[PDB]
Amino acid sequence: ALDTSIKVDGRRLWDSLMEVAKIGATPKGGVCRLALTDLDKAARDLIVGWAKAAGCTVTVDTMGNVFMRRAGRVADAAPVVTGSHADSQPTGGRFDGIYGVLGGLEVIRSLNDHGIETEHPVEVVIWTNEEGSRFAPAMVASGVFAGVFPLEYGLSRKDVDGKTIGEELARIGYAGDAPCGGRKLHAAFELHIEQGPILEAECKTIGVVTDAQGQRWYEITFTGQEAHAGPTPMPRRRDALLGASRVVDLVNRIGLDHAPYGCATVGMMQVHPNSRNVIPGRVFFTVDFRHPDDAVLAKMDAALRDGVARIAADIGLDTALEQIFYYAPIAFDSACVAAVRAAADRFGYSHRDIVSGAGHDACYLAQVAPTSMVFVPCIDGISHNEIEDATPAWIEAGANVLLHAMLSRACEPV
Amino acid sequence: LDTSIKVDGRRLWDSLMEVAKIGATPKGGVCRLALTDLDKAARDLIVGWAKAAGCTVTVDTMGNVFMRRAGRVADAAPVVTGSHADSQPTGGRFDGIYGVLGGLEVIRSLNDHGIETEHPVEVVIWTNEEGSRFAPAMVASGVFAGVFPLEYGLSRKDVDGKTIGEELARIGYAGDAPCGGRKLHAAFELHIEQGPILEAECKTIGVVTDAQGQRWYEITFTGQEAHAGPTPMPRRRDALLGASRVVDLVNRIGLDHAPYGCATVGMMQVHPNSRNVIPGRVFFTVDFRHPDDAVLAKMDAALRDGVARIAADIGLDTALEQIFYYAPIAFDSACVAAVRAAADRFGYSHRDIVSGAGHDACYLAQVAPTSMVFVPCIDGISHNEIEDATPAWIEAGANVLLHAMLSRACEPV
Ligand SMILES: [Zn+2]
Ligand SMILES: [Zn+2]
Ligand SMILES: [Zn+2]
Ligand SMILES: [Zn+2]
Secondary structure, X not given: XXXXXXXOOHHHHHHHHHHHOOOOEOOOOOEOOOOOOHHHHHHHHHHHHXXXXXXXXXXXXXXXXXEEEEOOXXXXXXXXXEEEOOOOOOOEOOOOOHHHHHHHHHHHHHHHHOOOXXXXXXXXXXXXXXXXXXXXXXXXXXXXXXXXXXXXXHHHOEOOOOOEHHXXXXXXXXXXOEOOOOOOOOEEEEEEEOXXXXXXXXXXXXXXXXXXXXXXXXXXXXXXXXXXXXXXXHHHOOOHHHHHHHHHHHXXXXXXXXXXXXXXXXXXXXXXXXXXXXXXXXXXXXXXXXXOOHHHHHHHHHHHHHHHHHHHHHHOOEEEEEEEEEEOOEEOOHHHHHXXXXXHHHOOOOEEEEEEOOOOHHHHHOOXXXXXXXXXXXXXXXXXXXXXXXXXXXXXXXXXXXXXXXXXXXXXXX | OOOOOOOOHHHHHHHHHHHOOOOEOOOOOEOOOOOOHHHHXXXXXXXXXXXXXXXXXXXXXXXXXXXXXXXXXXXXXXXXXEEXXXXXXXXXXXXXXXXXXXXXXXXXHHHHOOOOOOOOEEEEXXXXXXXXXXXXXXXXXXXXXXXXXXHHHHHOEOOOOOEHHHHHHHOOOOOOEOOOOOOOOEEEEEEEOOOOHHHHOOOOEEEEEEEOEEEEEEEEEEOOOEEOOOOOHHHOOOXXXXXXXXXXXXXXXXXXXXXXXXXXXOXXXXXXXXOOEEOOEEEEEEEEEEOOHHHHHHHXXXXXXXXXHHHHHHOOEEEEEEEEEEOOEEXXXXXXXXXXXXXXXXOOOEEEEEEOOOOHHHHHOOOOOEEEEEEOOHHHOOOOOOOOOOHHHHHHHHHHHHHHHHHHHOOOO
8 A cells, every 4th residue: 555666757757748838838938828729739749649659549539639548458448537638828837737638648658667557448638628718618628528518519619719619629630530428437537736825835745636616607798888088978978898897896806705715806808999098888808706615606696697787787888798607516536535545645645635726627527437636736826827836746746646546446347 | 241152061071971981880980090001091082182172282200191272472371270080990980080171171162262362271181190009199290299209209109019100101101291390370170079068059169269188198007817716815916906996996086076077998908818817917098188287187196196005905016107198278369269250150159168189289289379160969979980960060160160261361471
């Protein structure tokens, strides 16, 4: 239970992270590699090539998810899968998502290095457009896989220029032939940086992820009337940016009113016509709500809808409000969680139970297969900023835990 | 009260409908930003009309276009009129272009009636008056009037980094004439009111006596982009939260100086503008106006104090620049009286009025006797594609412009 002779090559994994970090590297040392751009294509191509060199067979499904499979002893056994996303935010870091993909690749290579045959096949997956930034919402491709969304929904999500996921998959050559979903998975694990400050602040090397908080995302367009910034008398103006700005403040208030765990953000805003001497006549913006308790998240939802109506009524704005994304907080599989904890104890790593504050493809996999996650810390807990960072020690430790948690389940007899 | 010398209202209205085709939008407005190919097309068309009406044409270093109808005295200083042909992105069919085409109609009407003036008469197109694509407004007439150095006018940049100077060269309006320097005998600008007063009070003509002051600002808040989820709420430095609080503050400052205070945030750029990233940088603009310079200065102080307080509470870095300021200005009393007498000549109803917008005439007033003629606009709406005016209003303002110009252009040298 403490045999540590089977372990990852930490430098090989770290160097693979530094190598993929070049694809979309930014001057501040981060990654700008939006989903289904040519840069996303190059990271996929590169990793697929590495996986094939490590003896994997590769398939690509209709949402562009990439499955890199290492055969097991039992040909038709359900796989133990791991993986994450290769796409990033525009202000993305070198570790969000890509660590889980490359950690999976390192598990494959380490099984080869040690000559280990597993009972179940093992797979590493790249999930498409996990961030939900260029096309919204997040996690749609694993949502299709898990049966939450129909394929036609995933393919029709659009970017700000009207390009669909389906068009861009075809453009970069990842409009795959395999069905999206359907296959039974034996178990799933995703390795990820925490994206918050807890593990680092508490000197814990491993986060044993037990739950993932829920989220609700919205799109709101206020319509008022564009008019002259000068001789339009102040009381009769219908300023859509005044309305949107008041909702930005309301959204923050709603976050703070559900402390300590409420999260609330307006991250995206488009003003029309955006001319300095024209009262804005139309403003589009997003709302991001999260809480670990479904009832509290629903309370935040009701408070937003009520407050938005009040703000629009006071100014005289028309409101188009859509909740474009919702999933309830989810508990990960107890046996998977135990396997992650057991793997941390095997190596003597410090650990604590933790709730994921971000969404991950694993949150949707948990609906169809026994799933949990492995966290490592990140420096100052920052993510979605180009200074996102992790130490070599953390990177290696998380991959050792992933390796043994996966081994534990993939060696169960069929 | 002799009204035999009057404009051709149909010819002027038709000219407005023709130019409105250049940049026409689905909503029935005009999207013809300064120094685009569409701005070039409107300039080219109007210049060709002016030359066919017997004008000689010059272009100065800021791209201002001077279409000149000679007078009896070859070297007398001109009586000038004119406005801008560029529009807002949500522009109407009358803002600016009416004063240009009204000037052209004056020239054609002088030709129709065989009138020789003592002073030459000129119609002018002033470059980039709106200050939307390149900011601030009125920079080309400001250069002309000696308010801004030429190199400042030429170096104003759009959101893609293109300068006025390079776009002038690109559309062929980097002219050879010096910008400013010529003495002007008098100047008049015809313009729609852009507010509701003249229509609401059933007055055909606004005798513009003053133009209110303005201060424009650019502000960038810098915080820290971070995850919209697991970044703990109390430690966030959200630049859009800060900017949004300033939008509300700006509105409050405007309302604190009712009824004449004007305050607007019209432009904002969020970075990185991703829905699950706390905004780390936000650029936005502030537009302040008031007819009283001391009140406008109070608005400035309240903005600077409030911005600093908002930034200090969140933990944001602030770059704040006032990029534009001119004090309220009173137009020339004799020009104002000429406009009033022209209204009375035709029996038009009128009232004195203060311009709520800026116009090139505001800067011309610093170097020559200047005033303005207003006509109403429907529902007082401007900078919206539904901006509208009746044919009666358009014709009446041009008749007043014609005789106010004639009154000054026929003064012996
Ligand atoms: Zn991620
Ligand atoms: Zn992310
Ligand atoms: Zn104008
Ligand atoms: Zn205007």
